[PDB]
Amino acid sequence: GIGHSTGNWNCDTIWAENTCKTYASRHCVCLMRDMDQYKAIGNANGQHGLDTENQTQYFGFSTPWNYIDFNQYSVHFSPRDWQQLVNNYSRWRPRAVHVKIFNLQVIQKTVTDSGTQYSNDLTGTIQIFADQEGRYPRLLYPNQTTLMGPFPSNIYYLPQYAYMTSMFNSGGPTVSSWWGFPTRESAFYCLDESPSQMLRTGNEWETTFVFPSSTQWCNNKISTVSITQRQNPLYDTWNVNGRGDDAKRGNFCTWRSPWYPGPYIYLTDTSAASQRLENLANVAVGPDGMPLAPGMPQYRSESDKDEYLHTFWVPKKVKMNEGDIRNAQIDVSTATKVQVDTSTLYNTCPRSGYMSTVSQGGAPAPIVWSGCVPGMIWDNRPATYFDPIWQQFPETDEQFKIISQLGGIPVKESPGHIFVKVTPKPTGAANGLIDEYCTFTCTVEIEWELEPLNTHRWNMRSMISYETTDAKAGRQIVDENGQYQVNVNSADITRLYMTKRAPRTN
Amino acid sequence: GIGHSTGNWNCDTIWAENTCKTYASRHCVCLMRDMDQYKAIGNANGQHGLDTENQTQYFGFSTPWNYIDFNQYSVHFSPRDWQQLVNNYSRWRPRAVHVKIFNLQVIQKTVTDSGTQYSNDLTGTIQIFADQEGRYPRLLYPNQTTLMGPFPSNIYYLPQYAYMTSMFNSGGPTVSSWWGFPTRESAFYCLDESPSQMLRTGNEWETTFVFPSSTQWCNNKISTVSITQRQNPLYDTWNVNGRGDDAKRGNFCTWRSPWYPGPYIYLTDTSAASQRLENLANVAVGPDGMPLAPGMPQYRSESDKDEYLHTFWVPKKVKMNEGDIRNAQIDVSTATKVQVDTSTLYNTCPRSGYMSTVSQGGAPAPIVWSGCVPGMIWDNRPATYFDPIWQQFPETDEQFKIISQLGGIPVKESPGHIFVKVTPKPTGAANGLIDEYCTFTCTVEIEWELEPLNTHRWNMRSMISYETTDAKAGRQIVDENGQYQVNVNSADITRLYMTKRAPRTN
Amino acid sequence: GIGHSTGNWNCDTIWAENTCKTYASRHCVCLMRDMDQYKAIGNANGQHGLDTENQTQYFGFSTPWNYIDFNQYSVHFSPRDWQQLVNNYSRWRPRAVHVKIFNLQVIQKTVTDSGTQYSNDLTGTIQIFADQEGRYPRLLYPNQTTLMGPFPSNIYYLPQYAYMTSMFNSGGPTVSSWWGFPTRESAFYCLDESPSQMLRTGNEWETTFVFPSSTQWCNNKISTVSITQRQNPLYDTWNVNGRGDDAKRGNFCTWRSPWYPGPYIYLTDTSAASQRLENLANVAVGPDGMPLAPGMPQYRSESDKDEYLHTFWVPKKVKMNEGDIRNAQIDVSTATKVQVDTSTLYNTCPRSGYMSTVSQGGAPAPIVWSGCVPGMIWDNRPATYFDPIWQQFPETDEQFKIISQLGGIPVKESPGHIFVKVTPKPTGAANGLIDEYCTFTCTVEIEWELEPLNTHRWNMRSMISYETTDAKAGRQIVDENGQYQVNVNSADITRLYMTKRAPRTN
Amino acid sequence: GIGHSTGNWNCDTIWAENTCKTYASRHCVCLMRDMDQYKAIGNANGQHGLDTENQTQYFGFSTPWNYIDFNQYSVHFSPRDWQQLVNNYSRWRPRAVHVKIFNLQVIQKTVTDSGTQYSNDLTGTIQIFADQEGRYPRLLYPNQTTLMGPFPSNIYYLPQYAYMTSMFNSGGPTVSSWWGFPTRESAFYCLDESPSQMLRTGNEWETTFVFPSSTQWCNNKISTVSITQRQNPLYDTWNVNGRGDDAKRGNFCTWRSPWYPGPYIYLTDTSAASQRLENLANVAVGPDGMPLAPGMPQYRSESDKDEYLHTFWVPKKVKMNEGDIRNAQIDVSTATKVQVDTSTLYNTCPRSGYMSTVSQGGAPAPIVWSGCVPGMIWDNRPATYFDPIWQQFPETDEQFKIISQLGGIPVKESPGHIFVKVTPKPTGAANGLIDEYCTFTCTVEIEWELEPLNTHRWNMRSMISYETTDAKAGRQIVDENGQYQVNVNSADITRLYMTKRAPRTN
Ligand SMILES: [Mg+2]
Ligand SMILES: [Mg+2]
Ligand SMILES: [Mg+2]
Ligand SMILES: [Mg+2]
Ligand SMILES: [Mg+2]
Ligand SMILES: [Mg+2]
Ligand SMILES: [Mg+2]
Ligand SMILES: [Mg+2]
């Protein structure tokens, strides 16, 4: 009946030898969206202006549905879980994802002369279905504010599910209306067409996703030797140097290499005002295009250059109940700009671009774009505790070495969206519904496959170490006001939240 | 006891239908290294000057241990073995590697008023362990002087095992000390930490390595038709020419191609004095960088251009007992500079760079870097009898089409180093050891998987043929002084030692 | 469903021969704490001023969770239960602790123009977990106001769980901020990370703790002979007196003793105003320190000296519903200062300090600190009905004869905290929750192992006896206003509530 | 026969879940001692002068025998082994000790006009016996130079076994002869009276010791809360403050404590010249006495005060072959004075001495000696990588809480000495022996029982982390000269080599 709990809270992380199982429980608010209406959404302005909102053209639909987005490490791992993971394991990948929705409460809001009264709707339902068929558009973009909070007691407002569809603008960037955008390929999806479980309070819901065995790993390995220095220092080579002459002793950089470092793309960083996407390094795709930053993983000496480094905001502090952040922009003052530095890429990755000329005898010049040629080896950018766990990629005919420089394990199969909405309860009058929302507990269980790191080096290795400065800074703890304070800067991510800690000998 | 041999000499090559088994026996000297001390080694100078020694910065360790390096074809194949291999087989790969160490003799050297006396230390031991776990740094660089000699009676001095580790120079290229180089990732490896067999005379040792079935093949196939000429000459095509017009009869080069040749990188060759790595076509990686030569396999008409051709020294003659060559540079006058020409790449490989412009209607210009695009097909550089058999690559997150332009079958798993050192026998006094070294016989057995070549062409095919000029030049024979004389020039490698002899019909 | 009770009220005490089982049922209020937020708490002022609040520096966290603290005798025993226990048994210890939580009611509070309305939230949950792993900080301090009331009908407000963590102050006692205090060892604990049962009304919860068999006993034995007088009075000894001379008849104090009394520490009592911890007998530990009172158990003739006597407040009266006492100081006028006198220690314990000199022939002087030397025997301070049952001690490397002079059976394993919180029910708006709290019945069952006292003395023994003065004083009964009135003074504890009643013959 | 090795080199460390097995192999030199003579040894001077040699009086015997001393962590663990141990495990203890002696070589030294010639004595024997019965005096003193070197390739010269016996000096400290010292209790032990294995080359020897299950653990736990702060910060206590008054809110230091910190002894540090033992804090025992430093474990703010901190020399660098160090004093310039700081004792240990007075109302004064009183809890000093593994204590009637402030797990049963000597081979002439010594390989295998650390704190914990400064300093690596360079200072031991890293929650 209505008096028995349908599930239990678990945020724990359970470590086994080669596996860990993470539990993420959140108290979840499912708000009714747009009076249970699908709405066509769009933006007519295509000027692609940086620093100014609504400059890309799109056509899409916001659904009345909400969905659950747990894809980040900070959701499923406590900071010491992350410390244990990155310090002790050379790689890891998610295996099974189990999501439970339980302890449903549909709450009727009623407005009275005094405040809003909250009453249980005992027979109220919510509708839940997991879309694992790819029946509906997947929202692929990482680290969007749709995510659960890192802290267990963060109230999670399920984001409203909305998607963009194929548009075509015959007009310019300044077109006033976006109703010229829809194309015959533009697809409206009614999620109400899908079969969905209806749940009263006392009903529970669960779904399982299993990652394929082909799922790639998040690699924690760092190379302890330059790929250029793999020769024996005490011996000459029969190979010649770069220009074909004698390879000198102890001058190894001049020796011809059996391999190349990874590809390299020169990217620019502009500080100027009123710059468009076309002022950045970019490529035009479909309606708009994309910038090329951060680009190919490459060692950078500097801690701040944002065009070559994966750069993202992390919230300084996290309020427990932030409310619904739909259509809300992250306040700049509440976050910090952090850049994941490539210092861990020093041994395996190009420090500069490939330098060559077509002119015979000409001085080698930097090559804007060096695509993958046979014999390239490179390491990926380090993951962070704030990165997505996986990155689903769009279905295309052809992929090459799929990786997101933004983060996540590139996957061709990922947990589908779990769509939730409060069943509309109409008042019997036109254009009206009984005001109500759902609260429930969602536990996300992730099976993790771990590979413990193995190093026979004599000397000690670096570890992620929580320090007194970290505690005085208030990292990974709550403040006096109840806010879980991340308090992260780029140097803090190097020292705490980066992967590629595990020294690799080969 | 001490009076029975622990093994037998075998240098033979045994041919089966799809397999050959090579035996390489060498009389092996294991010298004590640095009084059984691990030493930190390094070079402070980073100016990367070509033509001048000690211009790359490195930090590493020389171990007291010695290791066995057999990775070259000339070690395991006689010249006629190579002739039989390259003439009769379209491809080959190593399968199992078996190494025997037997007939150990620990020899005590004692200095007397008259000369040095040599006595057996009958209870002296050597320590041997194969590192197949990748526990210790692998020395990946091909054709380093650590190799066994091509001739069976060459005395093989086991090279001292030394490696370079991650360094970081905050200073410039001119820094005086290399003790600023070590980093927290820099790993000292004590090989004495590994379990190792101790062997007296009368003990034998063996290890087996099996290449994975995923091991790539050394390909002996040459294309007998240009990839551009694969159309039927007698018929028109419905396809258009390059600019979209009628495809004319018997003008096939102008027809649009179903495929592209391989990637192309323009490289420069500089003859100037006092040139650094940065004057060559190159890329910066970690502490130093690498030159880009020879680059992508591409047909070259000329016999000598060293920047596009795999170029290496081959010794003119090989002394049977050369002594320990540790820290010795190959004498320029004792070797010859040979360049493996790409004439066998004529049909499958780009003869020039890709020629295109961004400017509409502009004249096509050479493209410095053409990375792999979908639809590229190409052939690898031909292997030589003097190439490594395999090339292990560094462990990285990501590889693309691993190949060494220097040679060898690119492998992700290769025989690990077999480490050998004389057990230190101390005198009972500080800083002193009984002077002693080990002689033993090492047999390296390699199983080879062969694919016999199949050609139905009516006319005869080219063969590697030993000629009277080869005999008068003294190739593949000893001279009057007992030196096995290779006497090779670039033309000699084309005619004798190159692969890609097997005509491929498709 | 919601219409069936999940448990029954039991406060009874059931006596068996060697065992009693106590039941403590309380009507329990679980209040939501700090809007379900973990808050960092601390005090910056370290002046350690007596008589003034907030003079110790600490850093810690208050959790949204509540916990159950039943550790006191007056909770589990009625006064006659205590009378029966102390009169009839030489010792007792707790064996099993069983806690039931049942008849849950989540009550929504709503504010209206007229008063606050209280409605059942029928699907509301609370979260409960017992932490028996020591996963979370145990609150070790005895007789803190977190306790249940002595009387069955006392409404028990579960205390908010909060803990202090390692701090380090580089500043002085006057530092303005406590955010300098956290250290790398300072640990924030999220109790929401633990798996916890969610319970609706109609769910019940229970946990069991079993004390180890190694659990010490609360000893009710008093010695009926001085440890100094254990000789036969009618006979001389061959032993000498204290200075080595003849041991005289009937002068036994001068005879050398086979044993010593317990250790002795001189403590001071200061009445002066504006005294700090450093004016008291004390020791500095970590951030602050501790006073040394009451110190080692020692006979005191006087009824009031608080530095040598276990001293604590007992409430004069106990209101049935006192409300939530979080952050509330006991009102001085509502309690009485009672001192447990050591009169029962007269025979076994030092009446003064050890008196000796280093100077040969010098007059013996009192020794400030006499630590345990071989041959010391002593009795513990008597327990009271108002003492804790057990005292858990902090985990340390080394313990010596663990005992709390404050009370309780020293234990290395005790019932863990049972953490309870109302599941936050959000309003769907930022920073807000439906105002609600839980009422439930908690029964604490304790198995007690008893040892009946055995005395063969001819004459009667003293007993705890309720007297007409006790009834006229209103002890152990309610007053006319419904308050359960303890009405205890030091003399009242000697006569009624002390242990060590059981005469021990040996 | 003589041509087969009797064992294999293993220095490896093998980690299992709850166990690790360490292998320590050393090349071991057994030198003939004193021409196979037992000699009476002694020192007549008893002035106990600090800073001057031979100031203690002793009588004893040096035996012709050598023994094996492996008792230190740095012998059996590589630095990363130590890092893995201290970072991942809350405690550890040794379980079984297995010692192998194999690959024996008896070497005859012969003097010739040119140098010394070294020849195998093939039929030469050494004598080995393990004394596990306690038949012979155990050398109990920790960290004496008799130890094996930390690095695997350190040549280990077995120390000559010598012991001191009961002496009594009726004279003064200035007596000229020590032949007055022997007493009827003074015991000469002939180790040649024991049965011992004789081994030729081709014989191997092994012994096993199993630690009792009662063996204590090396504790890696640090407390994350002060033992003074274990109360709930949000609640008042019924307990009174130190002087018996109201316990104020947030002033916890003034509350009476359920426990005391550990014992405290005030120690002095004198810098003056020509000071004797009697100028230091000390106690006279038997012939001489002992100083009291470092004393009871107590938190010290300062990094350098040597009287309260465990203080010892660590060698800056370690030569591989140092020769025989018998009767050799550590060169001051070759070591560093390091002090293990008590910062990890901050929460559990007294920061100052107990402060009290006998005078009523008198100001509390520091108490020179506070011995253990009931209710004391404390933590031990942290172990270091350079500490002994165990400390055997002398057999006595009575022990109290045996611990060495110098280090090691206090044990009543430890591996006995393995005594080795070269069998004297006489020349057939009076007072002469064929000059010979033995080299052999000794492997010491230790089974370790591990307890993995378990912490549920939300935030990260501190870790031992090898840093770039550590690598630039050359720690845990060899230098360019082949010396294994420890390069340790007090701050380096805090950060790298100390135990008590594992945060303990309770
Ligand atoms: Mg050239
Ligand atoms: Mg050279
Ligand atoms: Mg055209
Ligand atoms: Mg045509
Ligand atoms: Mg006398
Ligand atoms: Mg008498
Ligand atoms: Mg007082
Ligand atoms: Mg108070």
Numbering used by the authors:
A (entry chain A), B (entry chain G), C (entry chain E), D (entry chain F): 30 to 535
Structure paper excerpt:
Parvoviruses are linear single-stranded DNA (ssDNA) viruses with T = 1 icosahedral symmetry capsids, affecting both vertebrate and invertebrate hosts. To expand the architectural repertoire for the parvoviruses, two aveparvoviruses affecting red-crowned cranes (RCPV) or turkeys (TuPV) were selected for structural determination via cryo-EM representing two species of the genus with ~55% amino acid sequence identity comparing the VP2. The VP monomer for both aveparvoviruses retained the basic capsid architecture with the conserved eight-stranded jelly roll motif (βB–βI), which is extended by the additional βA-strand and one alpha helix (αA). Like other parvovirus capsids, the surface loops are dominated by the large GH loop, located primarily at the threefold region; the DE loop, which forms the fivefold channel pore; and the BC and EF loops, found at the two-/fivefold wall.
In the 1980s, ChPV and TuPV were identified to infect juvenile chickens and turkeys, respectively, and as potential causative agents of enteric disorders, affecting growth rates in poultry worldwide. Following cryo-EM data collection, three-dimensional reconstructions of both aveparvoviruses, utilizing 405,850 RCPV and 35,131 TuPV extracted individual particles, were determined at resolutions of 2.66 Å and 2.35 Å, respectively. The short threefold protrusions of the RCPV and TuPV capsids are primarily formed by VR-IV and VR-VIII. The VR-VIII loop of TuPV contains an insertion of a single amino acid relative to RCPV, whereas the VR-V loops have identical lengths in either virus. Another region of divergence is VR-III or EF-loop, where TuPV has a two-residue insertion compared to RCPV, which is located at the two-/fivefold wall. When superposed, the surface loops of these aveparvoviruses are nearly perfectly overlaid, with only minor differences in most surface loops, with the exception of VR-III where both ChPV and TuPV adopt a different loop conformation than RCPV due to a 2 aa insertion. With the technological advancements in recent years, cryo-EM is capable of generating high-resolution maps of macromolecules that allow us to discern fine structural details, such as water molecules or bound metal ions. Both RCPV and TuPV maps had conserved additionally ordered densities in the threefold region of the capsid, which represented potential metal-bivalent cation-binding sites (most likely Mg2+ or Ca2+) with ordered water molecules. The bivalent cation at the side of the threefold protrusion is coordinated by identical amino acids in RCPV and TuPV, including D262, T263, D272, and A273 (RCPV numbering) of VR-IV and Q355 of VR-VII. For TuPV, two water molecules were observed at this site, due to the higher resolution of the density map.
